[PDB]
Structure formats: C-alpha cells, structure tokens
Amino acid sequence: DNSSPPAVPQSFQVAHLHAPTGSGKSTKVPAAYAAQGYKVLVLNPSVAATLGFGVYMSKAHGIDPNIRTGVRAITTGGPITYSTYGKFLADGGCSGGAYDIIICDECHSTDSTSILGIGTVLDQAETAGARLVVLATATPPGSVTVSHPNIEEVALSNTGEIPFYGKAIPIEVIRGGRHLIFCHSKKKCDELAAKLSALGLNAVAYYRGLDVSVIPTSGDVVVVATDALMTGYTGDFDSVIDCNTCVTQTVDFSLDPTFTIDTTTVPQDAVSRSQRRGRTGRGRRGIYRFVTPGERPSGMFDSSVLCECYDAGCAWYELTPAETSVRLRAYLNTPGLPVCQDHLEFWESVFTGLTHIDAHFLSQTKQAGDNFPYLVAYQATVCARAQAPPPSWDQMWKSLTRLKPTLLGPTPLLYRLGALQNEVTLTHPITKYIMACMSADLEVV
Ligand SMILES: Cn1cc(CC(=O)O)c2ccccc21
Numbered sequence: 001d002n003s004s005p006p007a008v009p010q011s012f013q014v015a016h017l018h019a020p021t022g023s024g025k026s027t028k029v030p031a032a033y034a035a036q037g038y039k040v041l042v043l044n045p046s047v048a049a050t051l052g053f054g055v056y057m058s059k060a061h062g063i064d065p066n067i068r069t070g071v072r073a074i075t076t077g078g079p080i081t082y083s084t085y086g087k088f089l090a091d092g093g094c095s096g097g098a099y100d101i102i103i104c105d106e107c108h109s110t111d112s113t114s115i116l117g118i119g120t121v122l123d124q125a126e127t128a129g130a131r132l133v134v135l136a137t138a139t140p141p142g143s144v145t146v147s148h149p150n151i152e153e154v155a156l157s158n159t160g161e162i163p164f165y166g167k168a169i170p171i172e173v174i175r176g177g178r179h180l181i182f183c184h185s186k187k188k189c190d191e192l193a194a195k196l197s198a199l200g201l202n203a204v205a206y207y208r209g210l211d212v213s214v215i216p217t218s219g220d221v222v223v224v225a226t227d228a229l230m231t232g233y234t235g236d237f238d239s240v241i242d243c244n245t246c247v248t249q250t251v252d253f254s255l256d257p258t259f260t261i262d263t264t265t266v267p268q269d270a271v272s273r274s275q276r277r278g279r280t281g282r283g284r285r286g287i288y289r290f291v292t293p294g295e296r297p298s299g300m301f302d303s304s305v306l307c308e309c310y311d312a313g314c315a316w317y318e319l320t321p322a323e324t325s326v327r328l329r330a331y332l333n334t335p336g337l338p339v340c341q342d343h344l345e346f347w348e349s350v351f352t353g354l355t356h357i358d359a360h361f362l363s364q365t366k367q368a369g370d371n372f373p374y375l376v377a378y379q380a381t382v383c384a385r386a387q388a389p390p391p392s393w394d395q396m397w398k399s400l401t402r403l404k405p406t407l408l409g410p411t412p413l414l415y416r417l418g419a420l421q422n423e424v425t426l427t428h429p430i431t432k433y434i435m436a437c438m439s440a441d442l443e444v445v
C-alpha cells in the first residue's frame with residue numbers, strides 16, 4: 001500500500017502517496033517533513049489550490065509558506081514552498097539545491113503543464129540534490145468507478161419516449177422530482193431541454209456562460225447540463241442521467257495535409273463518471289442512469305497533450321524540443337503515472353523544424369491564453385510571410401486581423417487546429433517538413 005507518507009531516505013528515491021483530497025497529503029505531510037528540518041516543495045496544477053494551501057498552513061499551523069504562481073510569488077523564507085507546476089517550470093525547474101523533498105500533488109493530472117512539470121522534477125531532482133520525490137494523488141492511474149453505497153445504478157434500455165445517445169429515457173422517470181441530465185454539448189442541452197419542455201416537463205439548460213439562478217432552488221425540474229455545472233452549482237438531485245461521453249482535445253493524423261488537433265467526442269473515463277454520478281445521493285439515496293457501462297479507467301491521455309508540452313516548452317519556458325523530450329522521457333519511464341503513446345521523437349522532430357517564429361505573434365497568442373500558442377503563432381507567422389489569410393477568422397487567428405485587407409489567396413496550411421474556411425495550398429516547405437516527420441516515424445506512419 002502507498003497510503004502512508006514515505007520516510008525521508010538517505011539518498012534519492014521516488015515514492016507514491018495515494019491519499020484522499022484534504023487528508024493531509026498536501027499540508028500535514030509537508031508540515032511534518034519541515035518539522036524534521038527538510039525543505040519541501042509542493043507542486044499543484046491549480047493556482048486556487050496553491051493559494052489555499054497557504055491559507056490553511058498559516059491559520060492551522062502558524063506556518064507561513066512561500067507561495068508561487070504565475071501572477072506573483074510570496075516569499076517568507078520558510079522551509080515549505082507551494083508552487084503551481086507552471087510557475088515551477090517558468091522558474092527554471094529544480095534550480096537546486098533548493099529543496100530536499102518535492103511533492104508532486106495531483107500527479108494523475110493530464111494537463112500539459114502538470115506532465116511537463118512532473119517530468120522536469122523527475123529528470124532534475126536527484127542532480128539538484130533532493131532526497132525524495134513524492135508522486136501524490138487521490139486518483140491513481142488505472143482507477144475505475146467503484147460502487148457507491150448510497151447510489152442505485154440503473155442502465156438505460158431502448159424502452160422510452162425520449163431518445164438519448166442510442167438509448168431511451170422513459171418520461172415517467174423524470175416527471176416529478178429534480179433530475180440532472182449530462183449532455184456532451186451545449187447544443188444537445190438546448191435540444192433536449194426544448195424537447196422536454198414541449199413534452200410538458202419543467203426543464204432548463206445549463207452550460208458555460210449562463211447564470212446559476214436559471215436553475216430553480218425548489219420545485220420539480222429537469223436540468224440539462226454540461227460539465228460546466230460542476231463548477232458551477234452546488235445542489236444535488238433525485239437522479240443523474242449520464243450520456244457517458246465527453247468532449248476532449250485529440251490529435252488525428254488525418255494527412256490533410258498533416259495532423260488535426262481539435263475537440264472530439266470520446267468515451268468518458270472513471271473520473272468523469274464518478275464526478276457526474278456524485279451529483280445525486282447526497283443526504284438521501286440517489287439514482288444514476290447510464291447509456292453504457294463504463295469506462296476508460298483514469299490515467300490515459302492523448303498524444304495531443306505531448307504536442308502541447310513541446311508547444312509550451314517553446315512558448316513559455318525557453319526549452320528546445322530536445323530539452324522537452326528529456327523531461328517527458330523521464331515521465332514516461334516512471335511507473336505509476338498517467339500513460340500515453342510514445343510520440344516523443346515525432347513531436348520533437350516537428351517542433352525542431354518550426355524555426356523563426358514571429359516574436360510579436362507569439363506574445364500575442366500567449367497573452368491571449370488560447371491553446372497551442374506556439375503552433376497558432378507559427379501558422380500565423382507563415383501566413384503573414386506569404387501574405388496569405390489564416391485557415392479561418394476564428395478568434396484564434398486574431399493577430400492577423402490588422403493585416404486582413406492585404407492577406408489573399410490560399411492558406412499555406414501547416415496542420416489543422418479548428419475548422420477550415422479558406423482555400424488551402426500544401427506547397428509550403430514547412431508543410432512538407434511536417435509530412436516527412438510523420439513518414440519518418442514508425443509509430444505515426
Ligand atoms: C502556462 N502556465 C501556467 C502557469 C500556472 C500559473 O499560473 O501559476 C504558468 C506560470 C508561469 C508561466 C506559465 C504558466
């Protein structure tokens with residue numbers, strides 16, 4: 001069992017800590033390490049969680065930790081430091097020998113910043129003079145949704161008036177009471193909520209960019225929502241009905257001309273299933289209805305996230321693709337972490353050829369906070385240098401707006417990051433370069 005905090009070893013060691021959120025793993029455990037005289041770094045994917053550790057440690061233990069985020073760093077000179085993974089990377093990683101112990105919290109996290117952060121720690125900690133790296137999570141990879149004592153789970157059949165993701169919902173099952181239906185998209189939420197209204201039911205849609213008050217506090221209601229609800233709203237429900245699908249970023253080696261990165265419908269994993277289910281069964285018995293028995297277990301992520309790491313290396317952290325590969329290699333080689341196809345050589349080769357980006361476009365896409373700032377600005381750079389329009393006039397291609405009256409002809413398409421709305425040419429040298437990266441890799445070709 002990995003349920004107890006590791007003892008500090010005499011020389012270097014990587015260990016796992018599996019413990020629930022709030023249980024002490026991010027707070028009590030580093031406090032106890034510091035009471036022993038060690039300097040402790042705690043990394044977390046969230047700015048909010050990171051600040052919150054500081055508030056807990058101060059008020060509960062009279063410990064004022066250092067707190068480091070992209071906005072600002074607060075330094076007390078104390079032995080414990082909380083940082084986001086992003087700020088840690090921006091600070092140069094293990095500029096040791098600063099810390100004796102590094103706790104990678106929520107180490108199941110599969111956002112690109114966490115992955116690159118954790119790989120950085122694993123590649124650098126020992127050389128930086130650390131004695132211990134703790135990979136801590138409340139949700140170890142390979143986790144599956146487990147039975148809940150207060151929630152009755154009932155599969156959907158094909159019997160029912162309301163068509164729902166290949167199955168049916170009987171109306172009797174949502175007439176009277178308060179029910180929550182998860183749909184994968186805002187459009188499905190609008191379609192279903194309209195349909196239910198027409199059937200005489202009290203239904204209302206909820207998603208990103210609507211007020212929480214549009215959900216009534218009392219009364220029979222059927223709420224039709226996306227995962228936006230969970231951040232979100234607080235009340236619980238008589239039942240949850242889950243479409244068991246979600247929208248996520250995926251790469252497709254679509255060869256038109258190269259690859260496509262976009263949001264795609266995919267099977268839901270154990271974490272999503274557990275979270276959606278958990279909106280019923282609070283304080284009384286709940287009901288969970290599902291389209292499909294799950295799941296993907298947790299802890300698998302898409303090759304597009306590896307791409308995103310190389311992107312971030314080049315955009316934010318002044319890392320060459322070769323440097324990024326070293327860090328990601330340490331991550332992939334460490335057992336017990338999230339897993340993904342080994343596309344390191346491929347993605348490295350691609351970014352290696354993306355030379356002479358325009359600095360001003362890159363600062364614009366960075367400041368704008370859109371995904372893949374490096375690839376978006378590189379496409380924009382290619383567009384401007386060819387006096388050609390962007391793939392579309394989506395907000396993505398914002399930096400080219402001032403130049404719009406002088407951009408014309410087909411887009412020299414490098415790859416696809418969203419919908420295509422202009423004529424394309426595939427003659428650009430970089431396009432050819434990226435196609436060759438694909439052909440030169442047996443895992444991708
Ligand atoms: C991409 N990215 C995320 C973070 C996390 C944070 O906001 O602390 C970050 C920090 C500094 C530089 C870049 C960063």
Ligand SMILES: [Cl-]
Nearest residue numbers: 022024025026
């Ligand atoms: Cl904790």
Ligand code: NA
Nearest residue numbers: 197201202203
């Ligand atoms: Na109504």
